[PDB]
């Protein structure tokens, strides 16, 4: 049947880090670059 969960193919990428989506990685990767080094704003936990 499905033999693979593939939607339309608009935003196959996602920044789990925050929970966003992107059309292509090239764009996401960069968006994740800023994410790096997540400092504890409130609750000190990883
Ligand atoms: Zn993100």
Curated annotation (Swiss-Prot):
It is found in: Cytoplasm. It comes from the Eukaryota. A zinc finger (C2H2-type) spans 13-35. Interacts (via the KRAB domain) with TRIM28 (via the RBCC domain); the interaction increases ZNF268 nuclear localization activity. Isoform 2 interacts with CHUK and IKBKB; the interaction is further increased in a TNF-alpha-dependent manner. Forms a ternary complex with TBK1 and SETD4; the interaction between SETD4 and TBK1 is ZNF268-dependent and leads to TBK1 monomethylation. Involved in the regulation of antiviral interferon signaling. During viral infection, recruits SETD4 to TBK1, leading to TBK1 monomethylation, which is critical for the assembly of TBK1 complex and IRF3 signaling. The KRAB domain functions to reinforce the nuclear localization of isoform 1 in addition to its transcription repression activity. Belongs to the krueppel C2H2-type zinc-finger protein family. This is Zinc finger protein 268. The lineage of its organism: Eukaryota, Metazoa, Chordata, Craniata, Vertebrata. The chain holds residues 887 to 919 of 947 of the full protein.
């Amino acid at each position: 049947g499905s033999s693979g969960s593939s939607g339309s193919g608009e935003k196959p990428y996602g920044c789990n880090e925050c929970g966003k989506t992107f059309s292509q990685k090239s764009i996401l990767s960069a968006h994740q670059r800023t994410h790096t080094g997540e400092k504890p704003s409130g609750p000190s936990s990883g």
